[PDB]
Design a protein around this ligand. Structure first.
Ligand SMILES: Nc1ncnc2c1ncn2[C@@H]1O[C@H](COP(=O)(O)OP(=O)(O)O)[C@@H](O)[C@H]1O
Ligand SMILES: Nc1ncnc2c1ncn2[C@@H]1O[C@H](COP(=O)(O)OP(=O)(O)O)[C@@H](O)[C@H]1O
Lengths: 269, 269
């Protein structure tokens, strides 16, 4: 099992990712693809006159306000535009992809944050209509069933809350969760940069290797505390959880997945 | 097997349809739900600044121009907004729904019209970038597989062309095709009117029964040739194909499916 998380930032080469995934699948490789689409969602939300709004936490720590209308646009883009673009591209390449959201078959379920603190005009308030949460359970039976039948699952949020509400959630954590549940050989994170890097945006700052043995060393403190903490420690937890390696790699280049599997990027192990 | 086609016109009561479908499913009834969303697609397309455009055929006979950008908005709304709204609603009602498009698992495949004649300024032209076609094949194995595992499939176009291109297609024909493939006990068409009616919009013109024995009678010529020909003859072909009855019913009212199954509307047999 390989799990490939495709990021949703600008300049993701979907046709390049599709071409690679499809040829891996055709070679007999087990794949699970997870994707996003936050950039395209914003663009669509701008155009529909419902611009993105962000909650600044008492930290903080900013997170998208996923009100119902924002969630709906999230659904249009993640579940509609991107999911089906990716499925179509895969079918053109000879891979029988099947696109699913966390709502479908109760694939992804978790807890909704029903009261989130934020700071507006220097006063702290409580937002009760934010549809965001975690993923704590996966319908692995369904994924297993589709995998056994030979389909290539292409998965996306939103997830389903325990009260059956669609909720936004962290796509990187879904991918990490899937990778640990399946004991994945590799978990690949693709994005519009070459990998984890010390001086962003300089692409020669690329860190090649992060041994989980040495995660609490000062060398690797810089990243584990800096901008990309959530991803880095998610990877560390995944490897500890049984995933043999986690690779951060480039989604722009040709053969993004193959290069990543050959170690080109940041390898957490 | 019951197949319920939910229309995509204004004022479709999705929560009412969901409530009914879910309680039927919980009673052990086999359901396949097919839906659309042409009205909401138009509204979204208006707002995105890509207004609907129609091709007037040499007849004609008008049909939506489904250029790639229109197809993408079609995907956002049918596959994103509506499909997931419906799946969420079903999950809230205790039914384990699974939403799929024709692209997913190659569920719906057919032939694309790659050159459509139209009349513009009284001159006949040929449009070569229209992504519309038929559905000729269904991945019944996949549907069977999901049905056996107990999921409630919620299906939608677009379909996949034989050249692996996403294409718009007639949702009513998909539902008719599914109903004949499964030998459905009933095929229900739900829309924002009480049924097939002689003097539209007068709702007392409701035709209760159309015997397929008498389809070529002058009485039933009015409908079989009039505004709703494609639906009426699709129903007639379905019943001949082995479907025991086809009901045209109201999507607005409470218990829309149950009422339809009890004969409330236009019953083709
Ligand atoms: N300088 C940067 N270095 C690393 N990551 C970044 C940088 N700037 C933005 N990002 C990441 O890009 C992400 C876009 O979301 P992502 O998880 O890729 O897709 P989605 O949320 O659509 O699944 C942001 O959450 C952010 O963490
Ligand atoms: N007066 C009318 N009587 C019957 N049907 C109508 C009338 N006016 C419009 N319609 C139907 O409403 C349909 C909307 O599309 P529909 O098939 O319900 O959903 P979708 O295309 O979204 O699956 C139109 O194709 C049209 O045939």
């Amino acid at each position: 099992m390989i799990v490939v998380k495709v990021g949703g930032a600008e300049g993701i080469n979907y046709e390049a990712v599709a071409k690679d995934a499809a040829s891996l699948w055709k070679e007999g490789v087990k794949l699970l693809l997870v994707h996003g689409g936050s950039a395209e969602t914003n663009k669509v939300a701008e155009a529909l006159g419902h611009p993105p709004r962000f909650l600044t936490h008492p930290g903080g720590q900013v997170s998208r306000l996923t009100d119902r209308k924002t969630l709906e646009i999230f659904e249009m883009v993640y579940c509609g535009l991107v999911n089906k673009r990716l499925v179509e591209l895969l079918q053109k390449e000879g891979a029988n992809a099947i696109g699913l959201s966390g709502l479908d078959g109760r694939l992804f379920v978790g807890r909704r944050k029903t009261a989130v603190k934020y700071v507006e005009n220097g006063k702290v308030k409580v937002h009760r209509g934010d549809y965001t949460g975690t993923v704590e359970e996966v319908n692995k039976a369904l994924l297993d069933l589709l995998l056994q039948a030979g389909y290539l699952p292409v998965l996306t949020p939103p997830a389903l809350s325990y009260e059956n509400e669609a909720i936004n959630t962290d796509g990187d954590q879904i991918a990490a969760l899937l990778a640990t549940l399946y004991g994945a050989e590799a978990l690949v994170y693709l994005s519009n940069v070459p990998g984890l890097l010390a001086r962003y945006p300089d692409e020669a700052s690329l860190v090649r290797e992060i041994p989980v043995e040495r995660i609490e060393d000062p060398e690797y403190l810089a990243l584990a505390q800096g901008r990309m903490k959530r991803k880095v420690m998610g990877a560390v937890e995944a490897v500890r959880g049984g995933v043999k390696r986690v690779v951060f790699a480039d989604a722009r280049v040709e053969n993004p997945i193959r290069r990543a599997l050959s170690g080109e990027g940041t390898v957490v192990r």
